[PDB]
Amino acid sequence: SGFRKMAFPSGKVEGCMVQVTCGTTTLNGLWLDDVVYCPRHVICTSEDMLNPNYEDLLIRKSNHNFLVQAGNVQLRVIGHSMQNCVLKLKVDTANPKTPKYKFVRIQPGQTFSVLACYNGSPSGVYQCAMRPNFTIKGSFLNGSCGSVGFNIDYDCVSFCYMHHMELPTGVHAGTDLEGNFYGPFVDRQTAQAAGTDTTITVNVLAWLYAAVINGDRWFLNRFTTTLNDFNLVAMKYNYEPLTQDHVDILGPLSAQTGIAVLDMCASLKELLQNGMNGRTILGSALLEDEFTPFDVVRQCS
Amino acid sequence: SGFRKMAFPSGKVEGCMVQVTCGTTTLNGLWLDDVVYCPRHVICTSEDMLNPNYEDLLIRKSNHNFLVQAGNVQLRVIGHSMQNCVLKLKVDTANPKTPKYKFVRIQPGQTFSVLACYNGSPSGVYQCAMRPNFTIKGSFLNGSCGSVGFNIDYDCVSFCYMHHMELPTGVHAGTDLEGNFYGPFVDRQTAQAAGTDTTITVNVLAWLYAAVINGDRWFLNRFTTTLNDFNLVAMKYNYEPLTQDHVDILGPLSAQTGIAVLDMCASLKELLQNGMNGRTILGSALLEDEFTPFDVVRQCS
Ligand SMILES: CN(C)CCCNC(=O)C[C@H](Cc1ccc(F)cc1)NC(=O)[C@@H](Cc1ccc(Cl)cc1Cl)NC(=O)[C@H](N)Cc1ccccc1C#N
Numbered sequence A, B: 001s002g003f004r005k006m007a008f009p010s011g012k013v014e015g016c017m018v019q020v021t022c023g024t025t026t027l028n029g030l031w032l033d034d035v036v037y038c039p040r041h042v043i044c045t046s047e048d049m050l051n052p053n054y055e056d057l058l059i060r061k062s063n064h065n066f067l068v069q070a071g072n073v074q075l076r077v078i079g080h081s082m083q084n085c086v087l088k089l090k091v092d093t094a095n096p097k098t099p100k101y102k103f104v105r106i107q108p109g110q111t112f113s114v115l116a117c118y119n120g121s122p123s124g125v126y127q128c129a130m131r132p133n134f135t136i137k138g139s140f141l142n143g144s145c146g147s148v149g150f151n152i153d154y155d156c157v158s159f160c161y162m163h164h165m166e167l168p169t170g171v172h173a174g175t176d177l178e179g180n181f182y183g184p185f186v187d188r189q190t191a192q193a194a195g196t197d198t199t200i201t202v203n204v205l206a207w208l209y210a211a212v213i214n215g216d217r218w219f220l221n222r223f224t225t226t227l228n229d230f231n232l233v234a235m236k237y238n239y240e241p242l243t244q245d246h247v248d249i250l251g252p253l254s255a256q257t258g259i260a261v262l263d264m265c266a267s268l269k270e271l272l273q274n275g276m277n278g279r280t281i282l283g284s285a286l287l288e289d290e291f292t293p294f295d296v297v298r299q300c301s
């Protein structure tokens, strides 16, 4: 029992992290087979960063402009190309530690694990949700660009995030591994804002179920509700509307506890109108919304 | 910027996890050089577990009673010995992925990373504090025994925890890697209770500093206090007394923010007497006490 913020084991990704240097700019890259993936703004000087034209800047580059280091062993770049906002550097050596992997794009409210790296050296691991406004509330310092986010599924690493920048508000923005940004952001050093965020309702309910499974029951009640009347109370408190497929995914948890989703929605409604009266749920005084139904099942099974 | 619950990269430990089987009992072991470490209660049947005599049970064992699996490759046991509550199995192959390592015992309030494993296969990573009553609030299912807790320091893994049992309250108890239990627990299946827990004051203050560094300032005040008057308010709220060496460790954070420790203690006092009035600090509605001053510096530097 117990419920913790849990990341995937990071070793399969650690064996892929390299250091990509161009000019005086150094960030992290991802070495899979004979290709290295990194953020394209590594080809930028500090002045280029204000209003870059990346097709121009890459055209003015040669393979020998790129220093790739897999630890102390420098790697030989034999080709380079752009894939939207990620740079691809072809190297002469396939990575012998390349795991089975996919490039996948995740939806808002889905979670993943981040391997925060600096100078190609992994330094920390944590869990993250993609917020509804397409930012992540990460933990990232200078040098972290090129750090990746991933999920693991039977020894296959699904890479879903590459880190590109920190917004003025201190939240973080990046791309998928094909270089398409999440949300309406671009890779240039201008003060960009995110839309207004919202609470991931389905995740809050998954976490309420985790609480019952771990023996926290004080918030439960005999009341039930309908799907339509709950969503009326969501919008008032800045919660996403609950769909019927969201109820369906919560099916297994509802089964394992004997608490219908709409029964649990009634308890959520009460917590929103009245707060917690100084009590906690799974060690938190807030409704936590960064655990998916899948994350809960994985930890409670 | 940002502040997340952060674990150490787990790859160096993943390369050490094996599956130790005796009879019908299977748990996780730790393979370093030519020795495998696991919890000694693997030599117990379900009846032995009630009131075991481990010197008797090990004496009745031979090397061939122990099945060790490093993945699919079975390992050859050539010797066995007991080290308090951990079993040592000597194998014929040194682990080629053995990292540089130490066995260290941690103090209450110190944190570490847990690699939760099942059948010798790593499945998740999270951070933990050793509570003042010598339990950890972990996340562990059947099969997790033998999972280890560790810190990393310049590619040296300091192993500090092996998981042995879950208490009736759902908290977890284990040993150091020399097999000495943390706290007053023993490896037998009886309902054991932990002493009363307390909040790690120095960690709460480290986390308040992390908040200021990340721009959360609403809780600050112009008041200051003395070391003696603060500790009077601690005991009333079940907080550990603050020592002068605790102030000293908080030195660097106090310097980096311009907020003397005793100035920050005044803000803590106010939060305890008045609560948060519905506001949050670093995404939490509670005073978090599982980040050490070291953890904060590492993430804010
Ligand atoms: C107290 N606290 C919570 C308040 C918030 C303080 N927050 C910052 O000061 C980060 C600033 C915020 C900012 C400022 C001016 C702008 F106009 C745009 C953004 N942001 C960067 O400095 C970008 C500029 C940038 C570089 C490259 C591209 Cl493509 C786009 C942009 Cl916006 N630097 C990176 O993100 C680096 N690569 C990685 C990095 C460096 C320093 C600090 C964090 C990180 C991360 N992670």
Ligand SMILES: CN(C)CCCNC(=O)C[C@H](Cc1ccc(F)cc1)NC(=O)[C@@H](Cc1ccc(Cl)cc1Cl)NC(=O)[C@H](N)Cc1ccccc1C#N
Binding pocket: A001, A002, A213, A214, A215, B041, B049, B140, B141, B142, B143, B144, B145, B164, B165, B166, B167, B168, B169, B170, B172, B186, B187, B188, B189, B190, B191, B192
């Ligand atoms: C809703 N929820 C929060 C309420 C709490 C429910 N909590 C439990 O039901 C776990 C029980 C609690 C218990 C019950 C009777 C006792 F008399 C002693 C302890 N505890 C075990 O079942 C030990 C018995 C045991 C085995 C070996 C030794 Cl040396 C000592 C003991 Cl106490 N089993 C392990 O710990 C396994 N190895 C690993 C394991 C198995 C199942 C579940 C969790 C874990 C973990 N982690």
